[PDB]
């Protein structure tokens, strides 16, 4: 009994050419395809771990940029808040600052006060 290749490999190829859709020129036609997808994989997994630090950052700038209007460092604003005992500002949600600034401004004296 001889098992010719038949469908099998054609199918495994297609599978990838699919993933490789929209890639530049030849990378969407082959095994340059695969090589490309290979790296793509690693890039995302790596970038998914980055997307964290990505925002952490974006947020901070946003805050530091805010509480500098009330005259101070993210470096101390954040400090007060630790003293202030408030876990509230998960940096994510100090996008208060952008909308509903009152609560921020409040949050400010709050740590200002918390300071000394």
């Amino acid at each position: 009994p001889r098992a010719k290749t038949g469908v099998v490999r054609r199918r495994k190829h297609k599978k990838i050419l699919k993933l490789a859709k929209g890639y530049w020129g030849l990378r969407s036609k082959s095994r340059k395809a695969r090589e490309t997808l290979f790296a793509a994989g690693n890039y995302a997994y790596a970038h998914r771990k980055r997307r964290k630090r990505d925002f952490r950052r974006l947020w901070i700038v946003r805050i530091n940029a805010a509480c500098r209007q009330h005259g101070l460092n993210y470096s101390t604003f954040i400090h007060g808040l630790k003293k202030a005992g408030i876990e509230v500002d998960r940096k994510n949600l100090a996008d208060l600052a952008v909308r509903e600034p009152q609560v921020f401004a409040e949050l400010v004296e709050r740590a200002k006060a918390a300071q000394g």
Binding site: F55, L58, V61, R62, A65, D95, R99
Partner: protein, 137 residues
């Protein structure tokens, strides 16, 4: 999902350079250029103020700089070296010394350069008065 700015009108500014340590001055002018004192900051976007500087020619600079500090400008050719000392700069077109140092603190991309275009410099004052101008410091 984090907030995201929509289109906005660009705030302008005006600065007086006289007495300012050139670099220390550039730094701010930079941080203004990126919409980075605003709290709704956005990297990919370019909503920076429109910093306008005047009395550039007067920029203080510490140490022996004027004499000592050299400006390299490499033309394309054999021995295109071209070293220009800090004084000759101010002495002839001086706006540069400031320009030539914000461009420096601006990031590198197309955006960086979009920004370098917001910044407008004269030694004067007498900048094209237009509207905004909220002096700063």
């Amino acid at each position: 999902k984090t907030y995201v700015p929509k289109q906005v009108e660009p705030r302008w500014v005006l600065i007086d350079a006289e007495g300012k340590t050139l670099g220390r001055l550039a730094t701010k002018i930079a941080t203004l250029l990126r919409g980075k004192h605003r709290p709704d900051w956005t990297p990919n976007v370019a909503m920076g103020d429109f910093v306008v500087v005047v009395n550039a020619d007067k920029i203080r600079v510490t140490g022996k700089k004027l004499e000592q500090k050299i400006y390299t400008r490499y033309s394309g050719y054999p021995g295109g070296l071209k070293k220009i000392p800090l004084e000759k700069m101010l002495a002839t077109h001086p706006e540069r010394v400031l320009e030539h140092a914000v461009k420096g603190m601006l990031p590198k991309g197309p955006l960086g350069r979009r920004l370098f275009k917001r910044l407008k410099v004269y030694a004067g004052p007498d900048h094209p008065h237009q509207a905004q101008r909220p002096e700063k410091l």
